[PDB]
From Swiss-Prot:
Coiled coil: none
Biological source species: Zika virus
Domain called Helicase C-terminal: residue spans: 150-329
The protein's name: Serine protease NS3
Top-level taxon of origin: Viruses
Topology versus the membrane: Peripheral membrane protein
Domain Helicase ATP-binding, first and last residues per copy: 1-155
Modification after translation: Acetylated by host KAT5. Acetylation modulates NS3 RNA-binding and unwinding activities and plays an important positive role for viral replication.
Length: 435
């Protein structure tokens, strides 16, 4: 696999040992051939799992999730997918890695899609080798792949709100369950219901993942309520998965705003990854997978793929050339390569709005291309009356950096800035000039 001009899709079933057995072997061979190597982890929890698998091998961990003293003589770097894309965007020089290994290469966040497009373009140009590690590569139509032990699959009605009766099977269980919900707000309602019934519940989401995941090992639990984030390597010691088979989809309407459409069916890849959390111990057959809906290819027209093109149009590759999206996922967006390319100063603003401002890619692009500087927050208050952000059924309010009390009415409306209590609290601080 290690020869140039070759991208290998390592697609063993979930739990086959791609991380703990296959990855150290690849790394030993790459170190033997003096290949400059990058290992890309989806999250910080996977990066820590990787240090345990690669202990004793000379790897430079470019993450603060690991506390290692680096010798300064390593030719293998390990960083998160987002870190790689971030450094490609920033003026920091990134080595031209001879071998690029992406673990959990099915991740659909904009920074992951952009990293795949960049790496696969370098391979197509004959400059590098690449290994994409995932049981569910782009385009997969099998939601029921192989497992370490047999799984009991059951199509059943799954509650999406609190309930009083009709779902005795949910609470009559004596093992541990991992339940996938379409959103944080939906997970809160179901968690409150289970807690009221005497259950011990832990809730996972993107912003709280590293902190709350530790609780699955530190304390006894009955249920874990999670969003799609637990599809990226998150290992659990569970005997059941309750899968709503639903997710929210960001959609750009009329090129003017972003809405959170749905809940709608997950892809075949997501359903297979959610099921993949159980049936992993060959000595414990009969883990349960209860699913409450079907799959559809909801990745078509999803805004993440448009955002990855916004990222790639602003990364240098060679003169005026721009990296293309990885061919199996290149048709999910109707976008012309280069249409989002910004000049030096607007690009610098675009980067800072995502990196420091913590804004979604699409929203940061609208601000930067309009000629607005990073610290100028006047667009947070001068939008139309139907762009008013609502908190507790009343217009949200902030004190501006001038000391004036104003209604949050952004010129560009992106539903992700107020999708939950935490996101809106962060957007209020941004609009106030607090970061
Ligand atoms: C945490 O998010 C990031 O780091 C990414 C890679 C996400 C999209 C671009 N930004 S950016 C400006 O490069 O920081």
């Amino acid at each position: 696999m290690l020869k140039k001009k070759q991208l290998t899709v390592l697609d063993l079933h979930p739990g086959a040992g791609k991380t703990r057995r296959v990855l150290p072997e690849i790394v030993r061979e790459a170190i033997k051939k003096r290949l400059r190597t990058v290992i890309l982890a989806p999250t910080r929890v996977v990066a820590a799992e990787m240090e345990e698998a690669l202990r004793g091998l000379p790897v430079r961990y470019m993450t603060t999730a690991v506390n290692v003293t680096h010798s300064g003589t390593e030719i293998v770097d390990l960083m998160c997918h987002a870190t790689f894309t971030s450094r490609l965007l920033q003026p920091i020089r990134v080595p031209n890695y001879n071998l690029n290994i992406m673990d959990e290469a099915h991740f659909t966040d904009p920074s992951s899609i952009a990293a795949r497009g960049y790496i696969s373009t370098r391979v197509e140009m004959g400059e590098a080798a690449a290994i994409f590690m995932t049981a569910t590569p782009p385009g997969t139509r099998d939601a029921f792949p192989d497992s370490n032990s047999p799984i009991m699959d059951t199509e059943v009605e799954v509650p999406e709100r609190a309930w009083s009766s009709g779902f005795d099977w949910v609470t009559d269980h004596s093992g541990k369950t991992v339940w996938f919900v379409p959103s944080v707000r939906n997970g809160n309602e179901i968690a409150a219901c289970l807690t009221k019934a005497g259950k011990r519940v832990i809730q996972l989401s993107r912003k709280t993942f590293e902190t709350e995941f530790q609780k699955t090992k530190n304390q006894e639990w009955d249920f874990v309520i999670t969003t799609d984030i637990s599809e990226m390597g998150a290992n659990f010691k569970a005997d059941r998965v309750i899968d709503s088979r639903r997710c929210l989809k960001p959609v750009i309407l009329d090129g003017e705003r972003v809405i959170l459409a749905g809940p709608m069916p997950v892809t075949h890849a997501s359903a297979a990854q959610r099921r993949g959390r159980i049936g992993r111990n060959p000595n414990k057959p009969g883990d349960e997978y209860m699913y409450g809906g079907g799959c559809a290819e909801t990745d078509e027209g999803h805004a993440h793929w448009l955002e990855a093109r916004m990222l790639l149009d602003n990364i240098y590759l060679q003169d005026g050339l721009i990296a293309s999206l990885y061919r199996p996922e290149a048709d999910k967006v109707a976008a012309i390569e280069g249409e989002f390319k910004l000049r030096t100063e607007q690009r610098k603003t675009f980067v800072e709005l995502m990196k420091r401002g913590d804004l979604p890619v699409w929203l940061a692009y609208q601000v930067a291309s309009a000629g607005i500087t990073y610290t100028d927050r006047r667009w947070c208050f001068d939008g139309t009356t139907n762009n008013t952000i609502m908190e507790d059924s009343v217009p949200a309010e902030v004190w501006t950096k001038y000391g004036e009390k104003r209604v949050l009415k952004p010129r560009w409306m992106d539903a992700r800035v107020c999708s939950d209590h935490a996101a809106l609290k962060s957007f209020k601080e941004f609009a106030a000039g607090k970061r």
